[PDB]
């Protein structure tokens, strides 16, 4: 059946579509079933269809965004704004609320507005991808570098707006975001920070401006449609070196984390974001599951040992990058070798020593950690046929016993739902992430349903242990928000009040982060 | 005449005071004229009285804060929450709206709730001063250090909540703030971040939690009364060295700023916040104005030269601190000497090489930049009789020509009012602050009115040139917010909608940051 916005008739939707065409042009409104297939979640969760877009609208300008938002208010049409819509693992471009119209800002709002070499920043529209920005920097012989997530095809803006992350010293994208322009839910436009001061040259220099600081309220949010965003860009160091440390035993995790923290908290000698990937992650990056095991159920111990030996990797594989003059790199690498060398069985490899099959991940991290965008990690999805993933990422204290607890409890449930445990432990400065990716056959309804049910259990069990997630998929947003319920659900009640005040007609991305406007609240959508 | 809350009769206010006494205890409510004198602005602006408190209430707990807020909602009494109320330069403890009750959270909510050595943080109530936290760290032989503003007697929490700043690598207090507990305007209590996840140990480890990030909305804000706040603490480095660079000429500012930026933007070799103080700042720290000039009008050129020669200082005096092992400090100091040594007349001094009166400021900066709180800068107020100051701090790009423009325009305007130009230029990473202090005789109604009228002009002239202030005094909040008026005042309209949604009775700090609730809007208060 044709996908319609909730409460909106075929005829009223057709009227709204024509109003959108009048704003953006006929070819920039998509509403046929075949056209919309490409905007469904590529990695669907649950057997049942969910998260169905009713249309896609591609505006060319801020003023067009304002007009789209005004039309949506008049007709009661929910809008799901995206930049590039590559939020794969968390829903892709698909809306939380079925029937919503996707506003694909990045299709035509794709300009690099400014790159400032001296102060080190960019001012971007949503359609600038990491590859686009890297191409600009390279072609202009920039002394700046970007900070990219594992895949380069997403949006510098869109990624930041979901509090996405990379792995250089500038890996906290929201931290380095500086200034934004946003269309609020009834169509008015606002600039944050020094952008609110007409004529200021400091929109991308000083984030806070004057008065209450609002920019974080537009991340993981449904309070507007962002049209411009600034971000600081780090100067490229004179040299860099990447390294891999393999650790042979599953149980080494405890000691690895307990050494990682003191080496990272002062930003030296671990200068970049530490990443500790398990053998399943690294094998999936370079091989298919059937190279190792073609049977039913969890991978047996003998097959895991074959992965390790054939790829010359450990159960846990640490990747880091060092920056600066050669003497500084040498000093820091010596400190890291001395410290992690206390773990029996640790072995060390630099990016210049190892470029075999098993070292493909090291070479990829060397690119990523130097702001060179990549799509090599798409090979993960070849682990099984029709591969897709969901991301499950609890936050905790950077404590080795806490890490072991999380490793074991997540792997136990993964085994029970017939999913491989693919995980990375990372530390920011003082916090730990358990970055779990679950890869499955997206064409199998049973596997889809298992992913949904397993991850609901993982969310609950993590919360029972005092862990909450930093980001989640459409299918889990209500459940994750429900875990943040100190003080009888005070946080969500606060967000709801703000949502209803800014969005009285309940238009923007209803249900994002579990935050529903009044007209949809308590309706099991 | 007795100061009353707007619209509240003397009899109703007396009843409300008894209600407050029943919550906090009779001795913890102040309401006599003499009791309230200490809570008036110590450094008043304008000849006419303004910013008069009606009472002070000192709660002992979050629950008492909630009860106070509920009473205030019932009676329509505005509340001005403070921590220690030492916001001198910006109004002291005094409320923006005359007649408001000051809620002095820090008098009795003064506990250090946790200092965590391994992860490097503190969880604090509002009454913990920098001196208190320093005493704790020293007495427990901590390996951590704090980051303090110039004066140590304020609140780690209160300072952060006005986006105050210090001078170590952790000088951006809000950046390092991690988690808070707040009583919202109708008395509900909420925890931000991982504090919303019951049982999480990461409240002070991971700032953002899940969903829209709100904590910045409680800074320079009137959206609640904060009762707990976390902040990260840096590890103390193994050694440190401070230095002064004297620059002889007024016009050296251009070249100094243009060298400061490249040496700071990568956080090395300028590892701490660079501060470039003019001769008036450094003289005022150690001497009275009449030592140099007792006449009418601006300070003559001959007297400026006498200050320089007597103190062995420049017109512009750069102060910095280096940290790390001795060899690292030596390397960075050599880089700094090489770079700034390109300016003719530059002279260099370490903190071990100046024991003269002129070196007093270097000794003070060496304390502050090492997280050792001080009150030595109170001597600034002895520049003139009954001395007080107001702070005027525009934000701009870290460009030497922009610095010269700001220097000249501010000094020109100050000269019209016979007020000395006391300024510091600082850089964060990519932004510049023009930290102006105007010192005046607080007992002289003509001086008070000059300061008001001068600073209103300075705000306007700065905005005309594209500079906006990062923070301001009660007297200037309406004028400063009016400068951030891109998009026909879009920013303020947004803040107003949020204020009215969270504070329907218009209770919390009306007019803070120029943000007035509906009941007071457009009333010239
Ligand atoms: C499959 C996968 C994913 C992945 C990854 C590795 C694999 C194998 N590694 C990641 C990593 O290292 N870091 C990270 O942050 N993400 C990683 N991912 C996930 C994903 O690939 C990336 O995050 C990707 O960059 C996200 O997609 P994109 O950049 O296209 O962003 P988007 O879909 O457009 O927007 C995301 C959400 O943000 C809000 N949004 C976006 N634009 C707007 C505008 N203009 N206004 C308002 N809100 C906006 C929406 O909520 C949107 O859904
Ligand atoms: C005179 C002077 C001042 C000064 C300075 C040098 C001189 C000579 N150097 C400073 C510096 O280096 N850095 C800086 O940030 N400030 C500097 N100052 C100004 C002042 O001394 C300090 O900022 C001082 O620490 C501020 O006072 P305090 O720390 O006592 O903070 P407060 O008055 O209690 O609160 C300030 C405002 O914040 C909001 N607030 C505070 N507590 C709450 C709670 N609990 N809930 C909600 N809002 C709260 C209020 O708006 C309050 O007015
Ligand atoms: Cl609006
Ligand atoms: Cl409330």
PDB file of N, CA and C in Angstrom, chain A residues 411-455:
ATOM      1  N   UNK A 411      29.041 -11.207  24.580  1.00  0.00           N
ATOM      2  CA  UNK A 411      29.306 -12.413  23.808  1.00  0.00           C
ATOM      3  C   UNK A 411      28.331 -13.524  24.176  1.00  0.00           C
ATOM      4  N   UNK A 412      27.970 -13.674  25.448  1.00  0.00           N
ATOM      5  CA  UNK A 412      27.013 -14.707  25.873  1.00  0.00           C
ATOM      6  C   UNK A 412      25.686 -14.535  25.137  1.00  0.00           C
ATOM      7  N   UNK A 413      25.170 -13.316  25.075  1.00  0.00           N
ATOM      8  CA  UNK A 413      23.880 -13.121  24.435  1.00  0.00           C
ATOM      9  C   UNK A 413      24.003 -13.234  22.934  1.00  0.00           C
ATOM     10  N   UNK A 414      25.102 -12.765  22.341  1.00  0.00           N
ATOM     11  CA  UNK A 414      25.325 -12.927  20.918  1.00  0.00           C
ATOM     12  C   UNK A 414      25.275 -14.405  20.564  1.00  0.00           C
ATOM     13  N   UNK A 415      25.958 -15.250  21.337  1.00  0.00           N
ATOM     14  CA  UNK A 415      25.961 -16.685  21.075  1.00  0.00           C
ATOM     15  C   UNK A 415      24.522 -17.250  21.091  1.00  0.00           C
ATOM     16  N   UNK A 416      23.743 -16.810  22.069  1.00  0.00           N
ATOM     17  CA  UNK A 416      22.390 -17.320  22.273  1.00  0.00           C
ATOM     18  C   UNK A 416      21.496 -16.936  21.104  1.00  0.00           C
ATOM     19  N   UNK A 417      21.770 -15.780  20.438  1.00  0.00           N
ATOM     20  CA  UNK A 417      20.972 -15.366  19.295  1.00  0.00           C
ATOM     21  C   UNK A 417      21.677 -15.657  17.962  1.00  0.00           C
ATOM     22  N   UNK A 418      22.708 -16.505  17.981  1.00  0.00           N
ATOM     23  CA  UNK A 418      23.403 -16.936  16.777  1.00  0.00           C
ATOM     24  C   UNK A 418      23.980 -15.776  16.000  1.00  0.00           C
ATOM     25  N   UNK A 419      24.658 -14.857  16.685  1.00  0.00           N
ATOM     26  CA  UNK A 419      25.375 -13.760  16.044  1.00  0.00           C
ATOM     27  C   UNK A 419      26.827 -13.774  16.494  1.00  0.00           C
ATOM     28  N   UNK A 420      27.775 -13.494  15.609  1.00  0.00           N
ATOM     29  CA  UNK A 420      29.169 -13.375  16.031  1.00  0.00           C
ATOM     30  C   UNK A 420      29.380 -12.118  16.873  1.00  0.00           C
ATOM     31  N   UNK A 421      30.268 -12.231  17.859  1.00  0.00           N
ATOM     32  CA  UNK A 421      30.711 -11.112  18.689  1.00  0.00           C
ATOM     33  C   UNK A 421      31.851 -10.365  18.019  1.00  0.00           C
ATOM     34  N   UNK A 422      31.520  -9.243  17.397  1.00  0.00           N
ATOM     35  CA  UNK A 422      32.505  -8.370  16.786  1.00  0.00           C
ATOM     36  C   UNK A 422      32.547  -7.090  17.585  1.00  0.00           C
ATOM     37  N   UNK A 423      33.674  -6.845  18.224  1.00  0.00           N
ATOM     38  CA  UNK A 423      33.747  -5.729  19.118  1.00  0.00           C
ATOM     39  C   UNK A 423      35.084  -5.024  19.059  1.00  0.00           C
ATOM     40  N   UNK A 424      35.018  -3.741  19.430  1.00  0.00           N
ATOM     41  CA  UNK A 424      36.179  -2.901  19.658  1.00  0.00           C
ATOM     42  C   UNK A 424      36.006  -2.232  21.016  1.00  0.00           C
ATOM     43  N   UNK A 425      37.022  -2.232  21.872  1.00  0.00           N
ATOM     44  CA  UNK A 425      37.013  -1.325  23.028  1.00  0.00           C
ATOM     45  C   UNK A 425      37.854  -0.113  22.698  1.00  0.00           C
ATOM     46  N   UNK A 426      37.323   1.081  22.991  1.00  0.00           N
ATOM     47  CA  UNK A 426      38.019   2.334  22.761  1.00  0.00           C
ATOM     48  C   UNK A 426      37.918   3.156  24.045  1.00  0.00           C
ATOM     49  N   UNK A 427      38.848   4.071  24.204  1.00  0.00           N
ATOM     50  CA  UNK A 427      38.819   5.056  25.278  1.00  0.00           C
ATOM     51  C   UNK A 427      38.928   6.421  24.625  1.00  0.00           C
ATOM     52  N   UNK A 428      38.127   7.341  25.121  1.00  0.00           N
ATOM     53  CA  UNK A 428      38.271   8.744  24.739  1.00  0.00           C
ATOM     54  C   UNK A 428      39.432   9.423  25.438  1.00  0.00           C
ATOM     55  N   UNK A 429      39.200   9.916  26.671  1.00  0.00           N
ATOM     56  CA  UNK A 429      40.212  10.293  27.612  1.00  0.00           C
ATOM     57  C   UNK A 429      39.974   9.574  28.924  1.00  0.00           C
ATOM     58  N   UNK A 430      38.730   9.636  29.434  1.00  0.00           N
ATOM     59  CA  UNK A 430      38.369   9.072  30.719  1.00  0.00           C
ATOM     60  C   UNK A 430      37.194   8.119  30.643  1.00  0.00           C
ATOM     61  N   UNK A 431      36.684   7.878  29.443  1.00  0.00           N
ATOM     62  CA  UNK A 431      35.494   7.055  29.263  1.00  0.00           C
ATOM     63  C   UNK A 431      35.834   5.906  28.337  1.00  0.00           C
ATOM     64  N   UNK A 432      35.041   4.833  28.442  1.00  0.00           N
ATOM     65  CA  UNK A 432      35.246   3.639  27.618  1.00  0.00           C
ATOM     66  C   UNK A 432      33.982   3.336  26.841  1.00  0.00           C
ATOM     67  N   UNK A 433      34.199   2.901  25.588  1.00  0.00           N
ATOM     68  CA  UNK A 433      33.134   2.455  24.702  1.00  0.00           C
ATOM     69  C   UNK A 433      33.352   0.998  24.371  1.00  0.00           C
ATOM     70  N   UNK A 434      32.263   0.247  24.393  1.00  0.00           N
ATOM     71  CA  UNK A 434      32.269  -1.126  23.946  1.00  0.00           C
ATOM     72  C   UNK A 434      31.542  -1.150  22.602  1.00  0.00           C
ATOM     73  N   UNK A 435      32.308  -1.012  21.517  1.00  0.00           N
ATOM     74  CA  UNK A 435      31.732  -0.794  20.205  1.00  0.00           C
ATOM     75  C   UNK A 435      31.427  -2.132  19.560  1.00  0.00           C
ATOM     76  N   UNK A 436      30.167  -2.565  19.637  1.00  0.00           N
ATOM     77  CA  UNK A 436      29.758  -3.854  19.146  1.00  0.00           C
ATOM     78  C   UNK A 436      29.057  -3.652  17.800  1.00  0.00           C
ATOM     79  N   UNK A 437      29.470  -4.462  16.828  1.00  0.00           N
ATOM     80  CA  UNK A 437      28.851  -4.472  15.534  1.00  0.00           C
ATOM     81  C   UNK A 437      28.301  -5.889  15.379  1.00  0.00           C
ATOM     82  N   UNK A 438      27.039  -6.046  15.037  1.00  0.00           N
ATOM     83  CA  UNK A 438      26.529  -7.374  14.802  1.00  0.00           C
ATOM     84  C   UNK A 438      26.165  -7.493  13.332  1.00  0.00           C
ATOM     85  N   UNK A 439      26.830  -8.434  12.647  1.00  0.00           N
ATOM     86  CA  UNK A 439      26.691  -8.599  11.214  1.00  0.00           C
ATOM     87  C   UNK A 439      25.753  -9.764  10.942  1.00  0.00           C
ATOM     88  N   UNK A 440      24.844  -9.573   9.986  1.00  0.00           N
ATOM     89  CA  UNK A 440      23.816 -10.563   9.742  1.00  0.00           C
ATOM     90  C   UNK A 440      23.386 -10.477   8.288  1.00  0.00           C
ATOM     91  N   UNK A 441      22.696 -11.538   7.851  1.00  0.00           N
ATOM     92  CA  UNK A 441      22.116 -11.612   6.522  1.00  0.00           C
ATOM     93  C   UNK A 441      20.802 -10.830   6.481  1.00  0.00           C
ATOM     94  N   UNK A 442      20.855  -9.652   5.842  1.00  0.00           N
ATOM     95  CA  UNK A 442      19.714  -8.752   5.809  1.00  0.00           C
ATOM     96  C   UNK A 442      18.547  -9.297   5.012  1.00  0.00           C
ATOM     97  N   UNK A 443      18.767 -10.338   4.200  1.00  0.00           N
ATOM     98  CA  UNK A 443      17.701 -10.928   3.405  1.00  0.00           C
ATOM     99  C   UNK A 443      16.930 -11.986   4.191  1.00  0.00           C
ATOM    100  N   UNK A 444      17.398 -12.346   5.395  1.00  0.00           N
ATOM    101  CA  UNK A 444      16.796 -13.409   6.190  1.00  0.00           C
ATOM    102  C   UNK A 444      15.890 -12.819   7.270  1.00  0.00           C
ATOM    103  N   UNK A 445      14.559 -12.979   7.181  1.00  0.00           N
ATOM    104  CA  UNK A 445      13.672 -12.380   8.172  1.00  0.00           C
ATOM    105  C   UNK A 445      13.925 -12.888   9.580  1.00  0.00           C
ATOM    106  N   UNK A 446      14.341 -14.146   9.701  1.00  0.00           N
ATOM    107  CA  UNK A 446      14.630 -14.704  11.012  1.00  0.00           C
ATOM    108  C   UNK A 446      15.842 -13.998  11.624  1.00  0.00           C
ATOM    109  N   UNK A 447      16.893 -13.772  10.816  1.00  0.00           N
ATOM    110  CA  UNK A 447      18.084 -13.086  11.313  1.00  0.00           C
ATOM    111  C   UNK A 447      17.725 -11.658  11.703  1.00  0.00           C
ATOM    112  N   UNK A 448      16.917 -10.983  10.886  1.00  0.00           N
ATOM    113  CA  UNK A 448      16.483  -9.638  11.213  1.00  0.00           C
ATOM    114  C   UNK A 448      15.787  -9.577  12.562  1.00  0.00           C
ATOM    115  N   UNK A 449      14.875 -10.524  12.804  1.00  0.00           N
ATOM    116  CA  UNK A 449      14.121 -10.547  14.042  1.00  0.00           C
ATOM    117  C   UNK A 449      15.041 -10.878  15.221  1.00  0.00           C
ATOM    118  N   UNK A 450      15.961 -11.819  15.041  1.00  0.00           N
ATOM    119  CA  UNK A 450      16.951 -12.126  16.065  1.00  0.00           C
ATOM    120  C   UNK A 450      17.765 -10.894  16.442  1.00  0.00           C
ATOM    121  N   UNK A 451      18.203 -10.099  15.446  1.00  0.00           N
ATOM    122  CA  UNK A 451      18.940  -8.863  15.747  1.00  0.00           C
ATOM    123  C   UNK A 451      18.105  -7.944  16.645  1.00  0.00           C
ATOM    124  N   UNK A 452      16.839  -7.737  16.296  1.00  0.00           N
ATOM    125  CA  UNK A 452      15.966  -6.850  17.080  1.00  0.00           C
ATOM    126  C   UNK A 452      15.854  -7.394  18.497  1.00  0.00           C
ATOM    127  N   UNK A 453      15.531  -8.673  18.642  1.00  0.00           N
ATOM    128  CA  UNK A 453      15.272  -9.200  19.974  1.00  0.00           C
ATOM    129  C   UNK A 453      16.543  -9.272  20.807  1.00  0.00           C
ATOM    130  N   UNK A 454      17.657  -9.643  20.198  1.00  0.00           N
ATOM    131  CA  UNK A 454      18.931  -9.702  20.901  1.00  0.00           C
ATOM    132  C   UNK A 454      19.318  -8.308  21.397  1.00  0.00           C
ATOM    133  N   UNK A 455      19.216  -7.291  20.534  1.00  0.00           N
ATOM    134  CA  UNK A 455      19.683  -5.982  20.929  1.00  0.00           C
ATOM    135  C   UNK A 455      18.759  -5.401  22.007  1.00  0.00           C
TER     136      UNK A 455
END
